[PDB]
Design a protein around this ligand. Structure first.
Ligand SMILES: [Cl-]
Ligand SMILES: [Cl-]
Lengths: 124, 120
């Protein structure tokens, strides 16, 4: 998607699932899917506080996931940590995922981005 | 997000919810939530056939949604039609949504995009 469209869809997404998350948490407890969707929107946000919150929400889901869900959670932990420039954490997550999903070229392109960013720092 | 990142995350999402949708479909019927989530990914895809399928899935959810859900469906119907260059349909959808959500500047910005592309 072009940039302006991507940004406005991102905002609409985040606001919808924030409402849903805040509604459910007001009504007692938050379903696993609602927490994941909100966290997924948070790690794509333009605000760093949002990304940090999405990471926390993904860490809370991680021990309760099926094996397939845990793979999805680790993907977005690497995304969030990469966007925060927590490169060594992101790199550890995506390498672990690639061991169990070797043909995941999305995870591979993410690893390439993380490596490229660690090179331009000089920290690789 | 930057362009390369946005594209690989879009692929990861689509494939994840395609598996969820197809697995629920084979097992009988598909939940509202999975059909929407798959449609949401499809409308954002780089393939026109995907966008068209997302519009179909959204059109099928629309008669049976609540008031709030319908407004969200119409937003993504506007997005998908805009990306397919179906500008008259897209403008109609977003103008309806703006009548009931007047403070929704994301819908407003989408309307400006539709209006720009029509004048291009
Ligand atoms: Cl279809
Ligand atoms: Cl509003």
């Amino acid at each position: 998607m072009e940039a302006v469209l991507n940004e406005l869809v991102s905002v609409e997404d985040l606001l919808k699932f924030e409402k849903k998350f805040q509604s459910e948490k007001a009504a007692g407890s938050v379903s696993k899917s609602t927490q994941f969707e909100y966290a997924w929107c948070l790690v794509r946000s333009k605000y760093n506080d949002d990304i940090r919150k999405g990471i926390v929400l993904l860490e809370e889901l991680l021990p309760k996931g099926s094996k397939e869900e845990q793979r999805d959670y680790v993907f977005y932990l690497a995304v969030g940590n990469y966007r925060l420039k927590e490169y060594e954490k992101a790199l550890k997550y995506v390498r672990g995922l690639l061991q169990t999903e070797p043909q995941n070229n999305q995870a591979k392109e993410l690893e390439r981005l993380i490596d490229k960013a660690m090179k331009k720092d000089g920290l690789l």
